[PDB]
Symmetry: C4
Subunit: 321 residues, 4 copies
Amino acid sequence: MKEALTFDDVLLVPQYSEVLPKDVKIDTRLTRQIRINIPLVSAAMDTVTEAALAKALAREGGIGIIHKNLTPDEQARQVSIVKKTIMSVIEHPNAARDEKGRLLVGAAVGTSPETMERVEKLVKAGVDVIVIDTAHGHSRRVIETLEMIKADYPDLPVVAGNVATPEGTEALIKAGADAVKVGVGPGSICTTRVVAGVGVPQLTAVMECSEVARKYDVPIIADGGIRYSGDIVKALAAGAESVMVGSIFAGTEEAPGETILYQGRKYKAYRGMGIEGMVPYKGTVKDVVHQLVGGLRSGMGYIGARTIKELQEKAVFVKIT
Amino acid sequence: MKEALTFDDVLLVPQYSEVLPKDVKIDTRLTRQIRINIPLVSAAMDTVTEAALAKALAREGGIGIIHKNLTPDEQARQVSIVKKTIMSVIEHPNAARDEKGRLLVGAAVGTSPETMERVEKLVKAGVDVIVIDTAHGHSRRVIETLEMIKADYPDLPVVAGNVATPEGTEALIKAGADAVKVGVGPGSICTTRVVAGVGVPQLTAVMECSEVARKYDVPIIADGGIRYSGDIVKALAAGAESVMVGSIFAGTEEAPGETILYQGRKYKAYRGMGIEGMVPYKGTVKDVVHQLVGGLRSGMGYIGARTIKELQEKAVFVKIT
Amino acid sequence: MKEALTFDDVLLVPQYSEVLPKDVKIDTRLTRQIRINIPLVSAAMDTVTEAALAKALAREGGIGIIHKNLTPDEQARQVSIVKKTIMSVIEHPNAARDEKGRLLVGAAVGTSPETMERVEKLVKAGVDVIVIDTAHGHSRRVIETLEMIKADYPDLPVVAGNVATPEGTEALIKAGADAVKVGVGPGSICTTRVVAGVGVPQLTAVMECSEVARKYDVPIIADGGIRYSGDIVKALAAGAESVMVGSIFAGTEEAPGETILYQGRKYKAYRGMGIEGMVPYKGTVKDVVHQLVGGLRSGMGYIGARTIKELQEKAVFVKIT
Amino acid sequence: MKEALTFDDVLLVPQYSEVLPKDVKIDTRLTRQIRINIPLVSAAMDTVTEAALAKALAREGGIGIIHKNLTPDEQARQVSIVKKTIMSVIEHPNAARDEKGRLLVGAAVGTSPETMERVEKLVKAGVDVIVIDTAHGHSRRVIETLEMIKADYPDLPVVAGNVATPEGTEALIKAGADAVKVGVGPGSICTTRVVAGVGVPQLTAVMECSEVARKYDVPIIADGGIRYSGDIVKALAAGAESVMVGSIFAGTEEAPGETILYQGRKYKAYRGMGIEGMVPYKGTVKDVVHQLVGGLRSGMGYIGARTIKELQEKAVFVKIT
């Protein structure tokens, strides 16, 4: 029986460095055809990403994936808002933009009967990337949806996932995925693990999947179990070219819910798909990105990596108890 | 020194799937001759199974084992109640029934002097299965009780246990067990482990025992340490064909105790063999089964398993830290 | 680097059994020449063993070691009280007695200048066994003290310890130890480990030490880290012939301190070598022994061991996570 | 993937001893040319070391490193205070002194533009040792700073660090380090690990680094993750010749902050580089040293080590779970 490792099981060994954190480059591929300026993708969750968060993150150089708990019309409207965003431009020099100068944005679809309806409307709204957003990417329905989307929109970037195995990554690449999203049961106490008994710890899932994907020059997006900026360094070091994060952005000003005051503390009142909640307020997307990017830069500094590609080439991990 | 693994030590790796959770089949063998419609057996515990719970579970397609902390007369009466249960029929399409159309039910016996008295009365009450219910199945007294029951009632299905080792499973099969119940010291903080220093972590006990039993086409019932629906997938994936659960059913409406209100919360006031208590109220047997079966279906979905047999053939486990 | 295991790292595998807990024999050697009727020795700690506890335990078939935080005169008086203890006799059939019919008792000495003074007075008080009671048995001073005691009192049973290594056990046996007490840094959060960085987890220390000692037919006493009756089964299964316990007896009526009532609960107000405290009241020595012996019997039952020697021959351990 | 061990993962095995704790020698090298009388170096942290703490520790036989969150002038003044410190002399017989009879003291520098300014002023204030104090010692900037300091002040003892790898230790030795400070990400919950994903557990970092350094007779200072006196024994046993400690000295009378009373308890109100806090008051530097030195002596006693060199030669570790 194989042991599989999570981010918390490992540490990166410091290496010889000639580069300061401020001078490392953190630009990366989202898909084989889309570049983002920082390696951060926001989760297609109804507590995380609508237009306001998506634009706030594109402006910082990442990309938001608009969630699909919306009618196809309203999801398209959200994409449009991001697409139709001069000091405002000058002040955001890292902003991730398309070939026309508009902020990048993505949208999630599933594999249900409205899927093509949704795709069509998202495309016409100017969406840059479609994410086939499912917990079980290695499945007939996801493969066929991917092939249908690809047959109809050959030039449309498609992220497919989620998977956690080399075979799953290869199947999705062979079917036309422009990036593969990795993460099945990441997070020790998540629903999939507890309810289904299913998962692959995320360090191992990233390393084995990225090894297959590299053979095809397809980028891996590591989705899930990112709690700390140190997890991003680890995920990217393990072979991911970007990381999708949810819970971390759920506490920002721009996340969908309401900001409230409770007993001297600021919270972000959540409301998803129903379920309701309240997470600590963490500031703006900008603040959160700054800390995360700060930590990424410092990890890269420690490893002497000038670029994300170098980080992966220079990565030496050790397992800890 | 062998390391032994519990359910919490492992996860199931997701596999290629063409089957939706709703379309997987969860029917299974209880014994070599009895089928149940879901893989759930309720514990022969005086806090878990009397007639009301046993009938509520048979109606959902599982089977209850009436506990033996009762006089042989009263235990027989409880079996009779279940046996003598039209919208009522229509509304429960998954109901586990005998060859005569009556809800299935089991009863526990021990190895003490009244054992045959009990057996006789349970049989005459129409019991479908006898469970030789002991913590130490691999023992002279359990083997002889089993042989005596089998000599007297050759056609009566007999579950014997509990065991945790291949040798124990083989001895009980050679003596006529129709199913072997596996679980000695499952649960990290259970009495047997703490008090006696004795146990085998349950994933390993299921895998080694089921390997022996498969040679004889005898079903393994995994008894103990099931906390979450994900544990059922793991137990069944490890070679069990059903799972016995106690603590999970202890909080239902139908479990023997009283439902009470304490400070705005519902509880199930327990009272066993004395000891007394209070567990959170979890709803009806139906509600609890639905969640458990939901989680089983989803795990099977993830693994692409259409049947329990396929789940065991497609099972790939990884060990986690 | 060797991994070393503690009691909590392992479990005993259940084996074929033809013997009931009530029919196992739990009599054992304390030293090569002294038998006790249950395998329990009380700790030579000023919070655990004076005359009252020592006699209460000898009466149950174990032996108390009177602590040495006393003047040689007062320590001798305590031994005398135990030695000079008819329904009273009849009611305690398991009582551990010397060749003259008096309750057995031991006393601790160190290696400081009064040591021989103490020894002489303890011997004249009728002490059955001397324990050279130190945290570091594998040392010049303990070896020489042992040789001096042995040269002066060749017939006096001497326990020497503590050690945790084969070399330490062999050195103490070669110097005349009649039993070797094993336990350096047992207990995860104990003083020796934290303060000195020193210890050997106790399962491994018992197994390697007992392996050396067996070559010489010298009994190993496992001292420390016994929290539960299951630990006794494990210690004895690992090669110990008795177990020394402190904290467990610290809460009994007979332990030196005062019994007090605090907010509806009974406590045992401790007072040692100064330091002061309060542990939950656990009942009488008799009550505590009964539970411990109960658990030992059940573990032996599970393993099919009729005697302590058989328990060690039938012991199969597995390591758990 | 290599597993790396922290202090908490291991224990020292007790060995044959002929030496009492009080008779072990704890004098050690700080650098290849500076001796201290106990193996304790205080952290160059603004919550730990200014003149008052530095002198209190030199008087006990250790050495303080004055922190660099000060202007070069004020940092020099702090060094001067320590340098310009008769019962006062008699009462401190273990005091660590230079060749002129003055208390030893160190000072931290970085690699920023004022570095040489700082060095010059510290040298003129009579500093005994310069510590190139950085989180990433294995870097161009630290190597060049070290070479510049060494070229300008060839006779000035220079500690360089921090590193956690053989290559880092060798690079710093080849560049003229007089001691190498080891510790990158030591402490399970420290900033470097969480924020950067970077670290090497400290037992392994000490053992591999000291192995390189020994080839050059350069002393390793183990910096970080010392919580208990048992950690010092472990660090020194693993190949370190001294240990740098911060948090432990942060609670002493002599540490920079204010002593306050809060609800019957004494605290040390901290104030660093801003951030503010409050740690439990632990007494004087003298009290804390006594306990630490007590624990070191006892560990050495247990291992039979007369000297720190013997401790390293006699060290047998075991890994625990």
